Design a protein around this ligand. Structure first.
Ligand SMILES: Cc1cn(-c2cc(NC(=O)c3cc4cc(c3C)C#Cc3cnc5ccc(nn35)NCCC(=O)NCCCCO4)cc(C(F)(F)F)c2)cn1
Length: 290
């Protein structure tokens, strides 16, 4: 620390936002912070736990990017220990995708169109996540849990990458429990991770392709038809995911580039970003023929 601190008197808890196996989240007001405003603070079911606290906090202060969830600091004066995050109006990206497509019948508010998310908004979401992964790959930080459930959405449809937390709880359909003390998002993992237990930046690229998949299917779980073991089988043996139907061939071409068996044979995340960004800012005329 080397970590910003926030006095408790500046933080006023309003109500709970969510609850994890080890942490709670409250929506709260935070005074004398900027330049008054709303923040999301997390409390800790302390057990030991006071070690991983000032570990995550130091990391989050190092990770400052336009597409990584902002971290304002901590409150260590007294208990419980708090981490002050910025508040993202629309919650996690998976809940946002499911609630806006393909029905979605009107269903859009202040930041989002009525019906299902347009091709331009889908590409805009993917581009932002890729942009966040380029940053993390630039610092050689491996995420090991890249999914929509770990991405937050704020006002003006700002997508930012984070790491729950909540994910382990009530999203347990997305995890395979092994050993009793460890769960694995095997549906998002590359073959060299499932088999060889190896996680690299190239493993994140595979994960992003699966995230890029999710976006164009509105939050639907990968290999939804399959069980945990069956999903492992298909990924190991080298089965690829479907594309229908909001995904243009040009975009599915990007997913497969992330889904090469050999990690070195995959494309860089900077490359994937470049293609997704161009497609995002491309004119309607170009996008209507995709
Ligand atoms: C191994 C390792 C990983 N990291 C690492 C950790 C991280 N942390 C995180 O992303 C993190 C962790 C966390 C909470 C939040 C975030 C963003 C948040 C938030 C937030 C802002 N507005 C809202 C509105 C509703 C909700 N949350 N919310 N739902 C309530 C969530 C729940 O119901 N349970 C969540 C409570 C418990 C979780 O506590 C981000 C990154 C990185 F990706 F940014 F680098 C890396 C550090 N070490």
């Amino acid at each position: 620390a080397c970590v910003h601190h926030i006095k408790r008197r500046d933080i006023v808890l309003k109500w709970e936002l969510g609850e994890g196996a080890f942490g709670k989240v409250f929506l709260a007001e935070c005074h004398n912070l900027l330049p008054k405003m709303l923040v999301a603070v997390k409390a800790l079911k302390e057990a030991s736990a006071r070690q991983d606290f000032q570990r995550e906090a130091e990391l989050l202060t190092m990770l400052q990017h336009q597409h990584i969830v902002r971290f304002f600091g901590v409150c260590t004066e007294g208990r419980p220990l708090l981490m002050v995050f910025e508040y993202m109006r629309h919650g996690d990206l998976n809940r946002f995708l499911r609630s806006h497509g393909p029905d979605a019948k009107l269903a859009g508010g202040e930041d989002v169109a009525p019906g299902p998310l347009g091709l331009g908004q889908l590409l805009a979401v993917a581009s932002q996540v890729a942009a966040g992964m380029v940053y993390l790959a630039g610092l050689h930080f491996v995420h090991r849990d890249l999914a929509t459930r770990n991405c937050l959405v704020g006002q003006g449809l700002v997508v930012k990458i984070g790491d729950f937390g909540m994910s382990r709880d009530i999203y347990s359909t997305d995890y395979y429990r092994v050993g009793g003390r460890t769960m694995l998002p095997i549906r998002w993992m590359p073959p060299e991770s499932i088999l060889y237990r190896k996680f690299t930046t190239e493993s994140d690229v595979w994960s992003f392709g699966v995230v890029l998949w999710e976006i164009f299917t509105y939050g639907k779980q990968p290999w939804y038809q399959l069980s945990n073991t069956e999903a492992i089988d298909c990924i190991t043996q080298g089965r690829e995911l479907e594309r229908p139907r909001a995904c243009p061939p040009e975009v599915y071409a990007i997913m497969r580039g992330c889904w090469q068996r050999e990690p070195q044979q995959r494309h860089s995340i900077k490359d994937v970003h470049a293609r997704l960004q161009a497609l995002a800012q491309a004119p309607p005329v170009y996008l209507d023929v995709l």
